[PDB]
Design a protein around this ligand. Structure first.
Ligand SMILES: N[C@@H](Cc1cc(-c2ccc(Cl)cc2Cl)cc(CP(=O)(O)O)c1O)C(=O)O
Lengths: 78, 147, 238, 286, 101, 152
C-alpha cells in the first residue's frame, strides 16, 4: 500500500512534465480515482504522451483489483 | 531368490541368530569341484509376504517344515525335454512343495499339482495421468441460456 | 449506453438526461455490478475440477490393434526373452514386430521413460506393477483398473502330484481369505504411498486453444460486421 | 501421559512468479494481435459510409479507462465495438477466475498424521526421525520388529539428550523428534515454532523408583493416593506448567509481499521511462 | 434352451415353462463342451438365491440352501454361474481353478 | 448371499450384521432398479455385476476401492474325474485370448465415463432476485412522472 501511494503521488506530479509542450490538486484527484474503480467526473489530460501515461496507470489499475479480489477468496473461507 | 514376496537377508549376531518374525533357510553353495571336500555351505533367514502366508498355513495345518533355497537348475523352465527347476525339484522328491513365484499355465501343471491362488496376476498395461484439463468452452459455460 | 456499463465501459458518451431517467441508468448500473460480480466468481470454480486419465479398454481396442490409425503417437514397450512375450505371440503376432526400437533393457528401465514421454504404454505382468505403483514419489505413475487385463492367472502353491496335502492346504488359504486376514497382509507388504484420493488440483498457465474457444465468436462478429457493411451500402447505392 | 510426534511447522507464503502467471507467455501476443485487428479494421470499415478515433478507442476499452474521444458514427463500427467490449470483459473475468482457482488450491504439503499412515511406514531418505539413545521408546520399538524399516534409520540418527535433539529441530537439521507427551505439550507452549499432532498410542504412566520390598513401599504408595483428591497435584499443575503463550496458528493463506509483486512495478517503471523518451520524439516531430 | 419353473419368483407358485438363457457363460460352457464332449440340458434354480447353511427344523441340524443345496443333494451335477470361492463352501464341494478374476 | 456369510462369520462388524438384519432384499435383480428410486440409498455386491452398470445406465456409479479379493469358478461335486481335465482346459483359454474375446463379446462397456461433473450450474430461478429489482424500477419509472409534474 505504501509504495502504491508513493508511485501514485510521483506519477501524478510528474504529469506536470506536459508543461514542456491543471494543478497537482487536479492530477491526484484523477489517478487516485481510477485505481479504486472510480466513475467520478474528471477533466481529462491534455497531451498524447499524457494519454499514454494514463493508459499505463490504467493497466496497473486493472491488475491491482483483479488480484486483490482474488485473494479475498481466502480470508473469507476460514 | 528375489521376488518381492520372499526376501533373503544375511545374518548379524545381534541375537546370535536371525529372529523376530523370520524363519531360517539354507542354500549349499560350492565351487571348484576338484576340492573333493565336504560339499555345501550355509545360508540366511527368509521373511516377507509368502513367508508370512507360509507361517499361518503351518501353525494352522499342524506340520513342521524346513526351507532350502535352490541354487542350480534355475527357476522352473524347459530344457532338453526334461524338467529342471522349481518344478523338477518337486518331481524328483528332493522336496515336497514349492511356495513363492509361480503361475498356473498348461505346462508347469502337467508335472506337479497346484493350490488355489492367493493373488491375481496377468498381462496389464501402465500409463500416465494426463496432467491438465482446462475446459476450452468455459467462457460461455457459467450462466445457462436462461439468463 | 446500456452495454458499456453491463460490461466495463464505452468512451464517455452523451444523453444522460430527463430528470426521472436519472434513476434508470443508475438501476442498470446496480444490476450490472451484481451481474458481473456473480459471473467473475462462479466462473472461478470452472477452473477447479478433478484430473483425467485415458479411458483405455482391454487391448481388444482400436487404439492398439492398429497403432497407426492415430499414426504418430503410440509406441508400446516391453522386455523380451521371457514368459510374457511368448504370451503376446499367440494372438497378437504383429505388435511384437511393431515393438522394434523400444526394447527397454530390463523391467526397471520403463520408469525412466515414463518420466520423459519416450514410452506411451507399457505391457507387462500385473502384480509386479501394482507393487511398483506405490513406489515412485511423483504420483504421475498408475495402472488401469482390474477385471480387464490380459493374462488372468495367479500364484498358487506347488504340491507334489497325487500327494495327500493338496486336499488340506485349501482349507487353510481359503480360510485365510474368508475370515479377514489376507488384505491385512497385503496392507503390510504390497500397498504403497499413493493409493489415495486424486483430489482437485489447480489448472495451468492458460494456453491458446482453451481461450481460443471464444476467438471464434469474435470472428463471427467480424463476419456480421462485414455483411452489415456490404448490405447497408445499397441504400447509398440507391 | 502418552507419546506424540513433534513436528516443526512452517510460516506460509504462496509463490507467484509475476502478475502474468496464469497466461502462457504466448497468449498476450495474439490478444494484442486481435486488438489491433478489430481496431484498425473498424476504422477503415467505417470510413466508407478518425484513425486515432479507433486506435485510442479500442486501446482504452480494454484498459477500462474512458480516455480521449472516439465513437461509432456509422452503423458499421457500432456492432464491432459492442462485441469487442464483451471480449474485453470475458478476458478480465476468466483471468480473475483462474487466479482464484490457484491462490486457494495451493496449501503446503499435508502435515504428518502420526504413526498410522504408510507415509512413515517407509522412511524415504529425505526427512528423518530421531529419539534419545537408550530411551524407553527405542525399547518399545525393538521388541516390535515390524518397524525395523524405521528402527534401522533411527539406528544412526539418535541423539544424546532430549534438549539437544529438540534444539536441533529449530534449525531445520532434523524434522521430527519423537518423545512422550508431558515434555512436548509443555515445550511448544513457550515459543512459536513447534506443534504436535496429538495422536496417542502409549498410555503409560510415570512413577517413582525404589528397590524391591524396601521399608518404604506402602507409605509412598499411600501418600500419593492422597495427593490427587485434595488438589495438591492440581495446584502443582497450575503453578509449575505455566501453559499458554501460543494460539491456534489459524492457517493464514499467504498475504502477498513485495518481491512476489515486483512484476507490476517493472510495468509502471517501463511506463515512467516512456515519459522523457517520448517527450523527445513526438515533439521533435513538432 | 433352458428349463425352469421360474415364471414366478418365490412368493407365488411355479408353472413349468422353458425359457432362453444366453449371454456370457454359455460360450465358456460350450468352449469347454466341445473340448470334453458334453451333451447337456441346463436347469435353473428353484430357490431364487445362492444358498448357504443355517439352523433348520427348529432343531440343531444343518441343511444347505439354494443352488448348492440343489447340487450336494445330487439333483444337480455341475455349477456354472458366477459362484464365489469361500471356505464355508470349500469343504463339501469341488471347485475348479478361477476363471474370471 | 456370498457376502452375508462373509459378514456373519466375523464379529468386528456385528453392528453392520445387525444393521442389515432387517432390510435385505430378495436378489440383486431388484436392487439396481431400487437405487434408481431412492428407497435403499446404497448397495454392496460383486464386481462384474456392478462395474458393468456404467455402460447400460449412467445414473449410478461405483466408488473405487476393493473389498475382498476372492474369485469365481465352476462348481463340481466331490472329486469327480472331470476335476482335472477341466482345470487343464481352462488355461487352454488364457493364452489364445478366448477370455479376451469374451471381454468384448459380453461387456459392451465404455458407453459412459466417471467424468467428475461441473460445479455450480447457475440459472434463472436462483438469480431472479435482481430481475425483480430492475422490474420494480422499470414499473416505478412509469409511475414517478405521474408525480413530478407537480414539481412544475
Ligand atoms: N510366475 C512366472 C514367473 C515370472 C516372474 C517374474 C518376475 C520378475 C521380476 C520380479 Cl521383481 C517379480 C516377478 Cl514375479 C516375471 C516373469 C515374466 P518376465 O520376466 O518375462 O517379465 C515371470 O514369468 C512364471 O512362472 O513364468
Amino acid at each position: 500500500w505504501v509504495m502504491m501511494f508513493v508511485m501514485l503521488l510521483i506519477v501524478s506530479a510528474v504529469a506536470v512534465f506536459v508543461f514542456e509542450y491543471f494543478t497537482i490538486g487536479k492530477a491526484i484527484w484523477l489517478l487516485w480515482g481510477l485505481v479504486f474503480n472510480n466513475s467520478v467526473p474528471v477533466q481529462n489530460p491534455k497531451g498524447t504522451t499524457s494519454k499514454i501515461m494514463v493508459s499505463v496507470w490504467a493497466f496497473f489499475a486493472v491488475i491491482f483489483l483483479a488480484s486483490y479480489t482474488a485473494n479475498l477468496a481466502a480470508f473469507m473461507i476460514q | 531368490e528375489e521376488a518381492p514376496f520372499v526376501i533373503v537377508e544375511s545374518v548379524d549376531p545381534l541375537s546370535g541368530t536371525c529372529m523376530r518374525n523370520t524363519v531360517p533357510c539354507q542354500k549349499r553353495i560350492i565351487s571348484e569341484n576338484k576340492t573333493d571336500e565336504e560339499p555345501g555351505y550355509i545360508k540366511k533367514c527368509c521373511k516377507g509376504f509368502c513367508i508370512d502366508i507360509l507361517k499361518k498355513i503351518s501353525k494352522s495345518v499342524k506340520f513342521t517344515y524346513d526351507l532350502y533355497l535352490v541354487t542350480n537348475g534355475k527357476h522352473g523352465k524347459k530344457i532338453n525335454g526334461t524338467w529342471n527347476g522349481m518344478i523338477g525339484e518337486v518331481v524328483m522328491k528332493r522336496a515336497y512343495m514349492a511356495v513363492g513365484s509361480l503361475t498356473i499355465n498348461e505346462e508347469r501343471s502337467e508335472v506337479v499339482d497346484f493350490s488355489v491362488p492367493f493373488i491375481e496376476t496377468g498381462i496389464s498395461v501402465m500409463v500416465s495421468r494426463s496432467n491438465g484439463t482446462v475446459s476450452p468452452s468455459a467462457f460461455l459455460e457459467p450462466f445457462s441460456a436462461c439468463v | 449506453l446500456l452495454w458499456g456499463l453491463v460490461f466495463n465501459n464505452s468512451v464517455p458518451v452523451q444523453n444522460p438526461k430527463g430528470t426521472t431517467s436519472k434513476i434508470m441508468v443508475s438501476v442498470w448500473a446496480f444490476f450490472a455490478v451484481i451481474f458481473l460480480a456473480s459471473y467473475t466468481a462462479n466462473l472461478a470454480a470452472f477452473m477447479i475440477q478433478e484430473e483425467y486419465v485415458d479411458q483405455v479398454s482391454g487391448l481388444s481396442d482400436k487404439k492398439f490393434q492398429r497403432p497407426n490409425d492415430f499414426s504418430p503417437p503410440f509406441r508400446f514397450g516391453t522386455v523380451p526373452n521371457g514368459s510374457t512375450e511368448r504370451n503376446i505371440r499367440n494372438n497378437y503376432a504383429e505388435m511384437h514386430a511393431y515393438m522394434g526400437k523400444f526394447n527397454q533393457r530390463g523391467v526397471d528401465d520403463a520408469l525412466l521413460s515414463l518420466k520423459t514421454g519416450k514410452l506411451d504404454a507399457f505391457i507387462y505382468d500385473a502384480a509386479v506393477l501394482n507393487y511398483m505403483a506405490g513406489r515412485d514419489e511423483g504420483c504421475k505413475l498408475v495402472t488401469i483398473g482390474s477385471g480387464k487385463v490380459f493374462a488372468s492367472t495367479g500364484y498358487g502353491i506347488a504340491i507334489q502330484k497325487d500327494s495327500g496335502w493338496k486336499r488340506q492346504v485349501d482349507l487353510a488359504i481359503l480360510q485365510l481369505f474368508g475370515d479377514g486376514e489376507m488384505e491385512e497382509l497385503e496392507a503390510l507388504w504390497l500397498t504403497g504411498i499413493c493409493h489415495n484420493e486424486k483430489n482437485e488440483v489447480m489448472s495451468s498457465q492458460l494456453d491458446i486453444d482453451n481461450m481460443a474457444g471464444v476467438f471464434y465468436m469474435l470472428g463471427a462478429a467480424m463476419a456480421l460486421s462485414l455483411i452489415t457493411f456490404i448490405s447497408e451500402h445499397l441504400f447509398y447505392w440507391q | 501421559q502418552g507419546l506424540t510426534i513433534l513436528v516443526k511447522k512452517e510460516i506460509p507464503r504462496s509463490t507467484l512468479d509475476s502478475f502474468m502467471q496464469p497466461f502462457q507467455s504466448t497468449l498476450w501476443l495474439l490478444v494484442g494481435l486481435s486488438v489491433h485487428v478489430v481496431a484498425v479494421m473498424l476504422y477503415l470499415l467505417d470510413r466508407f459510409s478518425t484513425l486515432s478515433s479507433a486506435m485510442w478507442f479500442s486501446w482504452g476499452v480494454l484498459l477500462n479507462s474512458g480516455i480521449g474521444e472516439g465513437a461509432p458514427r456509422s452503423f458499421s463500427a457500432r456492432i464491432l465495438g459492442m462485441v469487442w467490449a464483451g471480449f474485453a470483459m470475458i478476458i478480465v473475468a476468466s483471468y480473475t477466475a483462474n487466479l482464484a482457482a490457484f491462490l486457494v488450491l495451493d496449501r503446503p504439503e499435508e502435515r504428518i498424521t502420526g504413526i498410522n499412515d504408510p507415509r512413515l511406514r517407509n522412511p524415504s531418505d529425505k526427512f528423518i526421525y530421531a529419539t534419545v539413545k537408550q530411551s524407553s521408546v527405542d525399547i518399545y520399538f525393538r521388541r516390535q520388529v515390524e518397524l525395523s524399516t524405521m528402527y534401522r534409520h533411527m539406528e544412526k540418527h539418535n541423539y544424546e539428550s532430549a534438549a539437544e535433539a529438540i534444539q536441533a529441530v529449530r534449525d531445520n537439521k532434523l524434522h521430527a523428534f519423537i518423545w512422550d507427551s508431558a515434555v512436548l505439550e509443555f515445550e511448544a507452549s513457550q515459543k512459536c515454532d513447534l506443534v504436535t499432532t496429538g495422536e496417542l498410542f502409549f498410555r503409560s504412566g510415570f512413577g517413582i523408583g525404589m528397590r524391591k520390598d524396601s521399608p518404604w513401599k506402602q507409605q509412598v504408595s499411600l501418600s500419593i493416593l492422597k495427593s490427587h483428591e485434595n488438589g495438591f497435584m492440581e495446584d502443582l499443575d497450575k503453578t509449575w506448567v505455566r501453559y499458554q503463550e501460543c494460539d491456534s496458528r489459524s492457517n493464514a493463506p499467504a498475504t502477498l509481499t513485495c518481491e512476489n509483486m515486483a512484476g507490476v512495478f517493472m510495468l509502471v517503471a517501463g511506463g515512467i521511462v516512456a515519459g522523457i523518451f517520448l517527450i523527445f520524439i513526438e515533439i521533435a516531430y513538432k | 434352451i433352458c428349463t425352469g419353473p421360474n415364471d414366478t419368483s418365490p412368493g407365488s407358485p411355479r408353472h413349468t415353462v422353458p425359457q432362453c438363457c444366453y449371454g456370457f457363460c454359455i460360450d465358456l460352457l460350450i468352449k469347454l463342451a466341445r473340448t470334453m464332449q458334453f451333451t447337456y440340458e441346463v436347469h435353473l434354480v428353484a430357490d431364487g438365491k445362492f444358498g448357504t447353511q443355517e439352523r433348520v427344523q427348529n432343531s440343531n441340524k444343518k441343511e444347505w440352501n439354494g443352488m448348492m443345496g440343489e447340487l450336494l443333494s445330487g439333483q444337480a451335477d455341475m455349477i456354472v454361474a458366477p459362484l464365489t470361492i469361500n471356505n464355508e463352501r470349500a469343504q463339501y464341494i469341488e471347485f475348479s481353478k478361477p476363471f474370471k478374476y
